[PDB]
Design a binder for this molecule. Structure first.
Ligand SMILES: CCCNC(=O)Nc1cccc(C)n1
Ligand SMILES: CCCNC(=O)Nc1cccc(C)n1
Lengths: 198, 191
């Protein structure tokens, strides 16, 4: 039955993404091959290849589910902060990015593996796809509330995403990441407090 | 002799890749531009990417010299004004269609992530840290962790160049980007 195989193939796709996220999150992309991931998912190499043409193609789908969870957790952390003004929402969002990007799995897959496997253009495209809307919305609300000078929203959003992604990559490869994270949080908080009217 | 061959090849490659991009010019065309045989070129450079590595170093050296000249010519009177002029200088130099082609489009792809990040950090981190350190010395910027602030500003400036380079409307993207970076610097100096 075609339907049976198609349901099992959809299940196989989920099992492979779950399996690869777990093993690559622990050991890194370079240290785990597709045969080990197929065994972990409990599926044949033939079923795996039917879903993902090669190792990089499975890695792209892992990045998507991780980035989905990163954005959901940033939104959850911002809501949990109880920020009462757009300026406080921005302060909470900056703190939320340093907390989420400090998760060892996000560090390994997004900050260390993804720039290498996706390349610069591919990494930029993913970061923008997931974060540009949230960032533009925070900026737009701050401007509407009179807490931020009216200025071009998309360019400010892109530049701030670049600053924050470079901050997280610096923390990811620091000799002392705990110190790097605390010092980065201080310079970002000073910069935001210099820019915001509130 | 070695150095002379290498100089001719780097000059030739920078000229032709600057014009047409890395993908559109092969090594045999560069060897002819330099006036050396393919044999002499392969003696000096393992492959196309290895020649490109050396071309990126001399292009990054030219970028730095052009930014330092533009900053000196600006008549910046204080470290804070030097920062503002350095940001304007980066937008001008990275808007050169040749710098766009070699550094913003070709280098990330040819060198890969790790290689490209190592080069861009080696050229950008030291000038940035020095600009911050002088502003703090002059009382124009709060004393705070210098390297972390330098990495944040380099992220902002790298993204600014990439956003302008790939924009539907680069002239508009450049005007708008210059305004948001001027507001960001005035915010940093106010923090
Ligand atoms: C593979 C691309 C990873 N970059 C990414 O997720 N960027 C990001 C997301 C939310 C918030 C911020 C500041 N940055
Ligand atoms: C994507 C741009 C990479 N930056 C680079 O390659 N060099 C550089 C030089 C001076 C200043 C800056 C910001 N960068």
């Amino acid at each position: 039955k075609r339907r049976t195989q198609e349901e099992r193939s959809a299940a196989t796709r989920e099992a492979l993404i779950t399996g690869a996220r777990k093993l690559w999150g622990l050991r890194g992309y370079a240290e785990v091959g597709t045969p080990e991931i197929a065994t972990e998912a409990g599926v044949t190499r033939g079923a795996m290849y039917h879903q993902f043409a090669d190792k990089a193609a499975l890695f792209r789908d892992v990045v998507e589910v991780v980035e989905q969870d990163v954005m959901a957790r940033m939104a959850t952390l911002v809501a949990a902060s109880g920020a009462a003004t757009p300026a406080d929402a921005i302060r909470a969002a900056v703190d939320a990015w340093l907390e989420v990007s400090g998760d060892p799995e996000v560090r390994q897959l997004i900050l260390l593996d993804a720039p290498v496997v996706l390349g610069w253009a591919g990494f930029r495209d993913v970061a923008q796809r997931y974060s540009l809307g949230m960032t533009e919305q925070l900026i737009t609300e701050a401007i509407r509330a009179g807490q931020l000078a009216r200025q071009p929203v998309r360019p400010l959003a892109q530049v701030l995403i670049g600053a924050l992604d470079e901050a997280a990559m610096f923390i990811a490869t620091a000799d002392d990441p705990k110190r790097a994270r605390r010092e980065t949080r201080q310079v970002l908080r000073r910069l935001i407090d210099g820019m915001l009217n509130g």
